[PDB]
């Protein structure tokens, strides 16, 4: 996952989970990428799936 096109002002809520470095499961890439932006780039991808 590439979060260059972020942030994005809105996200469709389809559920395809990812696991972040913060042990939080993000519902989909869009939610995931906007959080990575929100963290100013601090957040990463641990793996795909729920944490």
């Amino acid at each position: 996952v590439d979060c260059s096109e972020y942030p994005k002002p809105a996200c469709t809520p389809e559920y395809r989970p990812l696991c972040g470095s913060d042990n939080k499961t993000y519902g989909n890439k869009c939610n995931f990428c906007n959080a990575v932006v929100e963290s100013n780039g601090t957040l990463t991808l641990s793996h795909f799936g729920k944490c």
Binding site: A10, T12, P13, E14, Y15, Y26, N28
Partner: protein, 185 residues
């Protein structure tokens, strides 16, 4: 199975919008963003209870899709959770609405605006959307937006969350009803 319940494609999980039909043919409505590129729908994560197959998909620009039921035994409740739906109506500013999703359950609020345009990026632009103060989270796609016994819309998307609060946009259900010739029950 009813509105607000989970639905599973090969790719992920959404929410059943409304149980509708034409003549003796039953379908279900959900988000176009869920129906795009999905063939079969299942009622459970295990992918054992088959629901039916995609008959139509309108996304982006709109955000509605339809699934022809192939499961003869599954009960197809014309409700949203326990809630009965008798008709459908058009959202109005200031209207009190309720959404039900498979991740979040039931959340209430009101219509803040009509005809909003929402850009999800990469040309995924949708238009003519109901704006509300209701929150929704991954998994909630395609859930029903109702007002008492009236069907109003289908969860398209938005921002924020149910903890901190948010903005959700819904696709008018009448447009979808009319496109396919179906009716709520």
């Amino acid at each position: 199975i009813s509105g607000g319940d989970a639905i599973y494609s090969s790719t992920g999980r959404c929410s059943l919008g409304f149980n509708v039909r034409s003549g003796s043919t039953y379908y279900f409505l959900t988000a176009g963003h869920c129906t795009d590129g999905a063939t079969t729908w299942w009622a459970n994560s295990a992918r054992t209870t088959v629901l039916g197959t995609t008959s139509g998909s309108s996304f982006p620009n709109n955000d509605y899709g339809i699934v022809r039921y192939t499961n003869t035994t599954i009960p197809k409740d014309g409700t949203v959770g326990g809630q009965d739906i008798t008709s459908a109506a058009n959202a109005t500013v200031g209207m009190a609405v309720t959404r039900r999703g498979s991740t979040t359950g039931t959340h209430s609020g009101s219509v803040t605006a009509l005809n909003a345009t929402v850009n999800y990026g990469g040309g995924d632009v949708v238009y003519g959307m109901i704006r509300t103060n209701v929150c929704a989270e991954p998994g909630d796609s395609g859930g029903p937006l109702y007002s008492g016994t009236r069907a109003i819309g289908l969860t398209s998307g938005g921002s924020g969350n149910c903890s901190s609060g948010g903005t959700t946009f819904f696709q008018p259900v009448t447009e979808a009803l009319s496109a396919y010739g179906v009716s709520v029950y």
